[PDB]
Amino acid sequence: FQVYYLGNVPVAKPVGVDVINGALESVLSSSSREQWTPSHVSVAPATLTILHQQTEAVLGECRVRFLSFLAVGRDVHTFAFIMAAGPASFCCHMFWCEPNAASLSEAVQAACMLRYQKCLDARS
Amino acid sequence: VAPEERHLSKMQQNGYENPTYKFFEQM
């Protein structure tokens, strides 16, 4: 079906379902569905690229090695991941997924798994 | 418990810590 990019917000910690549900509640409170940006995520072990639906304009690109955490929200449509934007600086990227966030969350976990193996292969 | 719902509940309850970041962090 369809993914919507909800945007991103700073967060205080690199990990935690509490942190991502906090971020999702803030963003959900301050936007209406009409404002949500239709999009899709190009997932690779190196990077995730968030692309606008028709135009394919780049809305973000995130390196998988600095993704610290990801989760599905308490509402099953929600997906979020936390990026270590810097050593002590964390940014949460959030999505609404129809029919639910399962396939996208699992793709992004899979990128992290393959990227991690690369890190081990690099130093074997 | 469908195959979806098991992985799905874990994704909600626990999420997932990227071992790449945890690896590259220790060093």
Short mmCIF file of N, CA and C in Angstrom, two decimals:
data_model
loop_
_atom_site.label_atom_id
_atom_site.label_comp_id
_atom_site.label_asym_id
_atom_site.label_seq_id
_atom_site.Cartn_x
_atom_site.Cartn_y
_atom_site.Cartn_z
N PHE A 1 0.82 -1.25 0.00
CA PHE A 1 0.00 0.00 0.00
C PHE A 1 0.84 1.29 0.00
N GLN A 2 0.95 1.94 1.17
CA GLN A 2 1.43 3.33 1.25
C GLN A 2 2.12 3.74 2.56
N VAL A 3 3.26 4.41 2.42
CA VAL A 3 4.05 4.95 3.53
C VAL A 3 3.93 6.47 3.47
N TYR A 4 3.89 7.10 4.63
CA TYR A 4 3.90 8.57 4.77
C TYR A 4 5.07 8.92 5.68
N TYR A 5 5.90 9.87 5.26
CA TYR A 5 6.93 10.42 6.14
C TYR A 5 6.30 11.46 7.06
N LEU A 6 6.44 11.29 8.37
CA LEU A 6 5.84 12.25 9.33
C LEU A 6 6.85 13.34 9.68
N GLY A 7 8.11 13.15 9.27
CA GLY A 7 9.20 14.07 9.64
C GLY A 7 10.11 13.51 10.73
N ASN A 8 10.91 14.39 11.29
CA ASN A 8 11.90 13.99 12.26
C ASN A 8 11.94 14.99 13.42
N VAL A 9 12.37 14.54 14.59
CA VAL A 9 12.46 15.40 15.78
C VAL A 9 13.72 15.01 16.56
N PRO A 10 14.30 15.98 17.30
CA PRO A 10 15.41 15.56 18.17
C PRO A 10 14.90 14.68 19.30
N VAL A 11 15.70 13.71 19.72
CA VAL A 11 15.39 12.94 20.91
C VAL A 11 16.62 12.90 21.82
N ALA A 12 16.40 12.56 23.08
CA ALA A 12 17.43 12.66 24.11
C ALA A 12 18.34 11.45 24.25
N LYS A 13 17.91 10.27 23.75
CA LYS A 13 18.61 9.03 23.94
C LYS A 13 18.68 8.26 22.58
N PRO A 14 19.69 7.41 22.40
CA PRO A 14 19.81 6.62 21.15
C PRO A 14 18.84 5.41 21.02
N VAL A 15 18.28 4.96 22.14
CA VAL A 15 17.49 3.69 22.14
C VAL A 15 16.23 3.83 23.01
N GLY A 16 15.24 2.96 22.77
CA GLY A 16 14.08 2.91 23.67
C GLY A 16 12.72 3.06 23.00
N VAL A 17 11.86 2.08 23.24
CA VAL A 17 10.47 2.18 22.75
C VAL A 17 9.75 3.38 23.37
N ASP A 18 10.10 3.72 24.62
CA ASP A 18 9.56 4.92 25.26
C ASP A 18 9.91 6.18 24.50
N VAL A 19 11.15 6.22 23.99
CA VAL A 19 11.64 7.41 23.29
C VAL A 19 10.89 7.57 21.93
N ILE A 20 10.76 6.47 21.20
CA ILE A 20 10.13 6.59 19.91
C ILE A 20 8.60 6.85 20.06
N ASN A 21 7.97 6.32 21.12
CA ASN A 21 6.52 6.55 21.28
C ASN A 21 6.26 7.97 21.70
N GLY A 22 7.19 8.52 22.49
CA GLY A 22 7.16 9.95 22.81
C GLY A 22 7.26 10.84 21.60
N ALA A 23 8.22 10.54 20.73
CA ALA A 23 8.38 11.26 19.47
C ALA A 23 7.11 11.16 18.56
N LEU A 24 6.56 9.95 18.44
CA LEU A 24 5.35 9.74 17.60
C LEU A 24 4.13 10.50 18.12
N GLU A 25 3.88 10.41 19.42
CA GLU A 25 2.83 11.26 20.03
C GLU A 25 3.01 12.77 19.74
N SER A 26 4.22 13.35 19.89
CA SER A 26 4.41 14.80 19.58
C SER A 26 4.06 15.12 18.17
N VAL A 27 4.65 14.37 17.23
CA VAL A 27 4.41 14.63 15.82
C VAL A 27 2.95 14.39 15.44
N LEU A 28 2.35 13.31 15.93
CA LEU A 28 0.91 13.06 15.67
C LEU A 28 0.01 14.20 16.18
N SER A 29 0.32 14.75 17.35
CA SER A 29 -0.47 15.87 17.93
C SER A 29 -0.45 17.15 17.10
N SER A 30 0.63 17.40 16.38
CA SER A 30 0.84 18.70 15.74
C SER A 30 0.70 18.69 14.23
N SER A 31 0.13 17.62 13.70
CA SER A 31 -0.08 17.54 12.25
C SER A 31 -1.43 16.90 12.02
N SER A 32 -2.00 17.09 10.83
CA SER A 32 -3.21 16.38 10.43
C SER A 32 -2.85 15.46 9.26
N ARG A 33 -3.65 14.43 9.01
CA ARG A 33 -3.31 13.47 7.95
C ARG A 33 -3.08 14.12 6.57
N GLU A 34 -3.74 15.26 6.32
CA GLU A 34 -3.61 15.98 5.02
C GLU A 34 -2.20 16.46 4.77
N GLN A 35 -1.47 16.69 5.87
CA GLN A 35 -0.09 17.19 5.84
C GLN A 35 0.97 16.10 5.65
N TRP A 36 0.61 14.84 5.87
CA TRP A 36 1.58 13.73 5.80
C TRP A 36 2.04 13.55 4.35
N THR A 37 3.36 13.44 4.19
CA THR A 37 4.04 13.34 2.89
C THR A 37 4.08 11.88 2.38
N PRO A 38 3.32 11.59 1.32
CA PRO A 38 3.41 10.24 0.73
C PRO A 38 4.84 9.97 0.27
N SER A 39 5.35 8.78 0.56
CA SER A 39 6.70 8.48 0.20
C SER A 39 7.00 6.99 0.21
N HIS A 40 8.22 6.65 -0.16
CA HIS A 40 8.69 5.29 0.00
C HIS A 40 10.18 5.31 0.37
N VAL A 41 10.62 4.21 0.97
CA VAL A 41 11.96 4.12 1.48
C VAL A 41 12.74 3.11 0.64
N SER A 42 13.84 3.59 0.08
CA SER A 42 14.79 2.76 -0.57
C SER A 42 15.79 2.25 0.47
N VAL A 43 15.73 0.95 0.72
CA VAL A 43 16.47 0.33 1.81
C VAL A 43 17.68 -0.43 1.27
N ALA A 44 18.87 -0.06 1.72
CA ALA A 44 20.08 -0.83 1.44
C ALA A 44 20.90 -1.02 2.71
N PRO A 45 21.73 -2.10 2.77
CA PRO A 45 22.61 -2.23 3.96
C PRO A 45 23.46 -0.98 4.28
N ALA A 46 23.87 -0.20 3.28
CA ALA A 46 24.60 1.06 3.56
C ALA A 46 23.74 2.24 4.06
N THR A 47 22.63 2.46 3.38
CA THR A 47 21.79 3.67 3.55
C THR A 47 20.32 3.41 3.41
N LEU A 48 19.54 4.25 4.07
CA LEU A 48 18.11 4.34 3.79
C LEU A 48 17.88 5.67 3.10
N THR A 49 17.20 5.66 1.96
CA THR A 49 16.82 6.91 1.33
C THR A 49 15.33 7.09 1.32
N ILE A 50 14.89 8.19 1.95
CA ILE A 50 13.48 8.55 1.95
C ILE A 50 13.19 9.44 0.71
N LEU A 51 12.25 9.00 -0.11
CA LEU A 51 11.96 9.60 -1.41
C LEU A 51 10.49 9.99 -1.49
N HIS A 52 10.23 11.22 -1.93
CA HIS A 52 8.87 11.65 -2.23
C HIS A 52 8.20 10.74 -3.27
N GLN A 53 6.94 10.42 -3.04
CA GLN A 53 6.16 9.48 -3.84
C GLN A 53 6.37 9.54 -5.38
N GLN A 54 5.98 10.64 -6.00
CA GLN A 54 5.95 10.68 -7.50
C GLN A 54 7.26 11.24 -8.08
N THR A 55 7.69 12.35 -7.49
CA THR A 55 8.82 13.12 -7.95
C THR A 55 10.15 12.46 -7.63
N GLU A 56 10.14 11.54 -6.65
CA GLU A 56 11.36 10.89 -6.17
C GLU A 56 12.40 11.85 -5.58
N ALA A 57 11.96 13.02 -5.15
CA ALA A 57 12.86 13.95 -4.46
C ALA A 57 13.38 13.35 -3.12
N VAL A 58 14.65 13.57 -2.81
CA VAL A 58 15.27 13.01 -1.60
C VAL A 58 14.84 13.85 -0.39
N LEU A 59 14.16 13.18 0.56
CA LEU A 59 13.70 13.83 1.76
C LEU A 59 14.65 13.58 2.94
N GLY A 60 15.44 12.51 2.85
CA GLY A 60 16.54 12.29 3.76
C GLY A 60 17.33 11.11 3.25
N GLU A 61 18.57 11.00 3.71
CA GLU A 61 19.33 9.81 3.48
C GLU A 61 20.09 9.55 4.75
N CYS A 62 20.01 8.32 5.24
CA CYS A 62 20.55 8.00 6.53
C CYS A 62 21.48 6.80 6.37
N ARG A 63 22.69 6.89 6.91
CA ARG A 63 23.61 5.76 6.91
C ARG A 63 23.24 4.73 8.05
N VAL A 64 23.11 3.48 7.66
CA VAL A 64 22.69 2.34 8.55
C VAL A 64 23.66 2.16 9.72
N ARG A 65 24.95 2.39 9.49
CA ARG A 65 25.85 2.35 10.63
C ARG A 65 25.64 3.32 11.80
N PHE A 66 24.98 4.46 11.56
CA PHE A 66 24.63 5.42 12.64
C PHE A 66 23.17 5.39 13.03
N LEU A 67 22.45 4.40 12.54
CA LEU A 67 21.08 4.13 13.06
C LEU A 67 21.26 3.38 14.41
N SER A 68 20.82 3.94 15.53
CA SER A 68 21.02 3.27 16.78
C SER A 68 19.88 2.28 17.13
N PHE A 69 18.66 2.63 16.72
CA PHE A 69 17.45 1.91 17.22
C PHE A 69 16.31 2.05 16.25
N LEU A 70 15.42 1.05 16.22
CA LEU A 70 14.16 1.18 15.47
C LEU A 70 13.04 0.38 16.17
N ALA A 71 11.80 0.74 15.85
CA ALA A 71 10.64 0.09 16.49
C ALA A 71 9.37 0.41 15.72
N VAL A 72 8.37 -0.45 15.91
CA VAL A 72 6.97 -0.15 15.59
C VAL A 72 6.35 0.49 16.84
N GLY A 73 5.61 1.58 16.68
CA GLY A 73 4.88 2.25 17.76
C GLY A 73 3.74 1.40 18.36
N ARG A 74 3.15 1.90 19.43
CA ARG A 74 2.05 1.15 20.08
C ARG A 74 0.86 1.07 19.11
N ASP A 75 0.69 2.08 18.29
CA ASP A 75 -0.16 1.94 17.09
C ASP A 75 0.65 1.32 15.97
N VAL A 76 0.18 0.14 15.59
CA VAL A 76 0.78 -0.70 14.56
C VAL A 76 1.06 -0.05 13.17
N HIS A 77 0.47 1.09 12.90
CA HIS A 77 0.77 1.78 11.63
C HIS A 77 2.11 2.53 11.71
N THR A 78 2.56 2.79 12.93
CA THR A 78 3.71 3.69 13.13
C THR A 78 5.04 2.97 13.06
N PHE A 79 6.01 3.60 12.41
CA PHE A 79 7.39 3.11 12.42
C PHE A 79 8.30 4.27 12.74
N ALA A 80 9.35 4.02 13.50
CA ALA A 80 10.37 5.07 13.75
C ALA A 80 11.73 4.47 13.91
N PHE A 81 12.74 5.22 13.46
CA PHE A 81 14.10 4.92 13.77
C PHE A 81 14.87 6.15 14.31
N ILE A 82 15.81 5.87 15.20
CA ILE A 82 16.68 6.90 15.81
C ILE A 82 18.05 6.85 15.14
N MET A 83 18.53 8.04 14.75
CA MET A 83 19.83 8.23 14.13
C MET A 83 20.75 8.93 15.12
N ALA A 84 22.00 8.47 15.19
CA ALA A 84 23.02 9.19 15.89
C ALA A 84 23.54 10.22 14.89
N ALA A 85 23.03 11.43 15.00
CA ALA A 85 23.34 12.49 14.04
C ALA A 85 24.75 13.02 14.35
N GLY A 86 25.13 12.87 15.62
CA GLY A 86 26.47 13.16 16.09
C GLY A 86 26.71 12.35 17.37
N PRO A 87 27.92 12.44 17.91
CA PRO A 87 28.29 11.68 19.09
C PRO A 87 27.26 11.75 20.22
N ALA A 88 26.70 12.92 20.45
CA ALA A 88 25.77 13.09 21.57
C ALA A 88 24.49 13.70 21.04
N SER A 89 24.15 13.39 19.80
CA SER A 89 23.04 14.05 19.15
C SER A 89 22.19 13.04 18.38
N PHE A 90 20.89 13.01 18.70
CA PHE A 90 19.98 11.93 18.26
C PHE A 90 18.72 12.49 17.62
N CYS A 91 18.32 11.92 16.48
CA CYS A 91 17.20 12.42 15.69
C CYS A 91 16.29 11.24 15.33
N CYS A 92 14.98 11.39 15.55
CA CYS A 92 14.01 10.31 15.32
C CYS A 92 13.19 10.62 14.06
N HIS A 93 13.20 9.68 13.11
CA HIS A 93 12.49 9.73 11.82
C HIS A 93 11.26 8.82 11.87
N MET A 94 10.11 9.34 11.49
CA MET A 94 8.83 8.70 11.80
C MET A 94 7.95 8.62 10.58
N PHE A 95 7.17 7.54 10.52
CA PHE A 95 6.38 7.11 9.36
C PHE A 95 5.02 6.58 9.80
N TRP A 96 4.04 6.70 8.92
CA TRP A 96 2.75 6.04 9.06
C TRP A 96 2.66 5.09 7.86
N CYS A 97 2.37 3.82 8.15
CA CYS A 97 2.46 2.77 7.15
C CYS A 97 1.11 2.08 7.09
N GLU A 98 0.60 1.93 5.86
CA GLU A 98 -0.61 1.19 5.57
C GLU A 98 -0.25 -0.07 4.77
N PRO A 99 -0.86 -1.22 5.09
CA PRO A 99 -1.84 -1.46 6.19
C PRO A 99 -1.24 -1.44 7.61
N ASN A 100 0.08 -1.62 7.71
CA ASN A 100 0.77 -1.57 9.00
C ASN A 100 2.27 -1.43 8.72
N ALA A 101 3.05 -1.28 9.80
CA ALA A 101 4.51 -0.99 9.72
C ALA A 101 5.40 -2.26 9.68
N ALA A 102 4.78 -3.44 9.68
CA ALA A 102 5.56 -4.67 9.75
C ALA A 102 6.62 -4.86 8.64
N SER A 103 6.22 -4.78 7.38
CA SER A 103 7.17 -5.04 6.28
C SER A 103 8.32 -4.02 6.20
N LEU A 104 8.02 -2.76 6.44
CA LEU A 104 9.06 -1.71 6.41
C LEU A 104 10.03 -1.83 7.59
N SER A 105 9.48 -2.04 8.80
CA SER A 105 10.33 -2.21 10.01
C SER A 105 11.27 -3.40 9.88
N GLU A 106 10.73 -4.47 9.34
CA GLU A 106 11.52 -5.67 9.09
C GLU A 106 12.60 -5.51 7.97
N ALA A 107 12.28 -4.79 6.90
CA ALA A 107 13.29 -4.42 5.88
C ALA A 107 14.40 -3.64 6.51
N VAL A 108 14.06 -2.63 7.32
CA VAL A 108 15.13 -1.80 7.93
C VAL A 108 15.95 -2.64 8.92
N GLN A 109 15.31 -3.52 9.70
CA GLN A 109 16.11 -4.42 10.59
C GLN A 109 17.07 -5.28 9.76
N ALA A 110 16.58 -5.79 8.64
CA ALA A 110 17.39 -6.62 7.73
C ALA A 110 18.63 -5.85 7.18
N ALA A 111 18.47 -4.56 6.85
CA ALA A 111 19.59 -3.71 6.44
C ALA A 111 20.62 -3.69 7.53
N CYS A 112 20.16 -3.43 8.75
CA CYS A 112 21.06 -3.42 9.92
C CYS A 112 21.79 -4.75 10.10
N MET A 113 21.10 -5.88 9.90
CA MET A 113 21.76 -7.21 10.03
C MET A 113 22.90 -7.45 9.01
N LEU A 114 22.61 -7.14 7.76
CA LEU A 114 23.60 -7.28 6.68
C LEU A 114 24.72 -6.26 6.81
N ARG A 115 24.38 -5.05 7.21
CA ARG A 115 25.42 -4.05 7.44
C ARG A 115 26.37 -4.44 8.58
N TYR A 116 25.80 -5.01 9.65
CA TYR A 116 26.62 -5.51 10.74
C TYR A 116 27.61 -6.63 10.31
N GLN A 117 27.12 -7.62 9.58
CA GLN A 117 27.99 -8.62 9.00
C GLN A 117 29.16 -7.99 8.20
N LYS A 118 28.86 -7.01 7.34
CA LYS A 118 29.92 -6.22 6.65
C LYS A 118 30.99 -5.67 7.60
N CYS A 119 30.58 -5.09 8.72
CA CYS A 119 31.52 -4.62 9.73
C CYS A 119 32.43 -5.71 10.27
N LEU A 120 31.87 -6.90 10.48
CA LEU A 120 32.65 -8.06 10.90
C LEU A 120 33.55 -8.59 9.77
N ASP A 121 33.04 -8.64 8.54
CA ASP A 121 33.85 -9.06 7.39
C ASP A 121 35.04 -8.12 7.13
N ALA A 122 34.86 -6.84 7.46
CA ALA A 122 35.85 -5.78 7.23
C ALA A 122 37.07 -5.95 8.12
N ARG A 123 36.86 -6.55 9.28
CA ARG A 123 37.91 -6.71 10.29
C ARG A 123 38.28 -8.17 10.60
N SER A 124 37.72 -9.11 9.81
CA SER A 124 38.01 -10.55 9.97
C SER A 124 39.48 -10.91 9.65
N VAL B 1 -0.98 -17.80 17.11
CA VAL B 1 -0.07 -16.64 16.81
C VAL B 1 0.55 -16.71 15.39
N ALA B 2 -0.06 -15.98 14.46
CA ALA B 2 0.44 -15.86 13.08
C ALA B 2 1.91 -15.42 13.06
N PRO B 3 2.66 -15.74 11.96
CA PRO B 3 4.10 -15.37 11.87
C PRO B 3 4.34 -13.85 11.93
N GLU B 4 3.49 -13.10 11.23
CA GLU B 4 3.44 -11.66 11.37
C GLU B 4 3.43 -11.25 12.85
N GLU B 5 2.33 -11.57 13.56
CA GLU B 5 2.10 -11.06 14.92
C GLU B 5 3.23 -11.27 15.93
N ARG B 6 3.93 -12.40 15.88
CA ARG B 6 5.08 -12.64 16.77
C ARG B 6 6.26 -11.64 16.61
N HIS B 7 6.82 -11.56 15.39
CA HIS B 7 7.88 -10.57 15.10
C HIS B 7 7.34 -9.17 15.35
N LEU B 8 6.09 -8.92 14.95
CA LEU B 8 5.42 -7.61 15.13
C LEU B 8 5.32 -7.17 16.60
N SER B 9 4.91 -8.07 17.50
CA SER B 9 4.78 -7.73 18.93
C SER B 9 6.13 -7.41 19.54
N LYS B 10 7.14 -8.18 19.17
CA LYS B 10 8.49 -7.92 19.61
C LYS B 10 8.99 -6.54 19.15
N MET B 11 8.65 -6.16 17.92
CA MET B 11 9.07 -4.88 17.32
C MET B 11 8.48 -3.72 18.10
N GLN B 12 7.24 -3.91 18.55
CA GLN B 12 6.55 -2.98 19.43
C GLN B 12 7.00 -2.95 20.87
N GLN B 13 7.16 -4.14 21.46
CA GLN B 13 7.50 -4.27 22.88
C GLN B 13 8.96 -3.93 23.15
N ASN B 14 9.84 -4.45 22.30
CA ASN B 14 11.31 -4.31 22.49
C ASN B 14 12.02 -3.39 21.47
N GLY B 15 11.44 -3.27 20.27
CA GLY B 15 12.20 -2.64 19.17
C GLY B 15 13.45 -3.46 18.86
N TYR B 16 14.46 -2.79 18.31
CA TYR B 16 15.67 -3.47 17.83
C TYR B 16 16.82 -2.47 17.87
N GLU B 17 17.86 -2.81 18.64
CA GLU B 17 19.11 -2.04 18.74
C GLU B 17 20.05 -2.51 17.64
N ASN B 18 20.51 -1.57 16.81
CA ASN B 18 21.37 -1.91 15.67
C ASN B 18 22.75 -2.33 16.18
N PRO B 19 23.15 -3.59 15.93
CA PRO B 19 24.45 -4.02 16.43
C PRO B 19 25.62 -3.31 15.73
N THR B 20 25.39 -2.79 14.51
CA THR B 20 26.43 -2.04 13.77
C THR B 20 26.85 -0.83 14.63
N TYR B 21 25.88 -0.01 15.06
CA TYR B 21 26.13 1.15 15.91
C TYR B 21 26.74 0.74 17.25
N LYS B 22 26.25 -0.35 17.84
CA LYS B 22 26.79 -0.82 19.12
C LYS B 22 28.25 -1.32 18.98
N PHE B 23 28.56 -1.93 17.83
CA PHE B 23 29.91 -2.39 17.44
C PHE B 23 30.87 -1.22 17.29
N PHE B 24 30.54 -0.32 16.36
CA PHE B 24 31.33 0.86 16.05
C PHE B 24 31.39 1.86 17.18
N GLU B 25 30.62 1.61 18.23
CA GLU B 25 30.59 2.45 19.42
C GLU B 25 31.67 2.02 20.42
N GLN B 26 31.75 0.70 20.68
CA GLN B 26 32.69 0.10 21.64
C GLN B 26 34.16 0.52 21.39
N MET B 27 34.57 0.48 20.12
CA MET B 27 35.87 1.00 19.68
C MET B 27 36.01 2.51 19.89
#
